[PDB]
Design a binder for this molecule. Structure first.
Ligand SMILES: CC(C)=CCC/C(C)=C/CC/C(C)=C/CSP(=O)(O)OP(=O)(O)O
Ligand SMILES: [Mg+2]
Length: 236
């Protein structure tokens, strides 16, 4: 890797857990259990190489359409993940955050995530950001409602709204936009993930199923990224 060109923010759509379990004739939930474990491997190598922000698409606002047993299983995984992995996150100076409407989660999931946010609040290393009950359209609808009330309550009209103002009112207001979006499994679509924020992101559509995505594969993705020529509408 070119150590002077490590992306500051990588966003990942963790797809393929269902297919990984079906290949093995195991229930879909087994693939999610293995996919929650794979998050630990990726957090480790992202922190070690000096990625500043890692946003993981854990559950979207459309994923409520899935069978309730699968929804409840995914919603409970964070409790398991933080129970075993929080000590290492503290030690590795990782700061845990979320984006999404995290109020709709099971109480025990809220408590486990809040405890992890509080225990890592002053950490200055990798920001590990879980997008849980998150969708880019719903994020915009919510930010729009906030902006409409803030402007009226400040005695402002809408002439002050520009792209920068919207950036500062999204759930990602404290993060830069990701340079790189990786999606596993093969699919080639963004499925409502960070739709405003990925306007100029590089995409990589990696063919491994999420539970098979490992350190080596993350490094190969960053190497691919470093070969991309980004133009932002201009000439190279
Ligand atoms: C955030 C946290 C600490 C733990 C939660 C971690 C996990 C595993 C969340 C499930 C992630 C999802 C919805 C993956 C889509 S794989 P898919 O079901 O779409 O697979 P398929 O397309 O059917 O192969
Ligand atoms: Mg899928």
């Amino acid at each position: 890797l070119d150590s002077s060109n490590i992306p500051e923010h990588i966003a990942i759509i963790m797809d393929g857990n269902g297919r990984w379990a079906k290949k093995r004739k195991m229930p879909r939930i087994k693939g999610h259990y293995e996919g929650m474990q794979t998050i630990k491997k990726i957090t480790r190598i992202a922190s070690d190489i000096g990625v500043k922000y890692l946003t993981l698409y854990a559950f979207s606002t459309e994923n409520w359409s899935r069978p309730e047993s699968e929804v409840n299983y995914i919603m409970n995984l964070p409790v398991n993940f933080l129970k075993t992995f929080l000590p290492e996150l503290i030690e590795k100076n990782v700061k845990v955050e979320t984006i999404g409407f995290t109020d709709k989660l099971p109480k025990s999931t809220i408590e486990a995530i809040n405890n992890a946010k509080e225990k890592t609040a002053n950490n200055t290393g990798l920001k590990l950001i879980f997008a849980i009950n998150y969708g880019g359209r719903a994020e915009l609808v919510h930010s729009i409602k906030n902006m409409f009330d803030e402007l009226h309550q400040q005695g402002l009209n809408s002439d002050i709204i520009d792209e920068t103002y919207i950036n500062n009112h999204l759930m990602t207001k404290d993060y830069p936009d990701p340079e790189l979006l990786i999606r596993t499994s093969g699919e080639q679509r963004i499925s409502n993930f960070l739709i405003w924020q990925v306007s100029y992101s590089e995409f990589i559509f990696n063919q491994k199923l999420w539970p098979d995505f490992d350190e080596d594969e993350l490094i190969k993705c960053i190497k691919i990224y470093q070969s991309r020529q980004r133009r932002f509408g201009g000439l190279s």
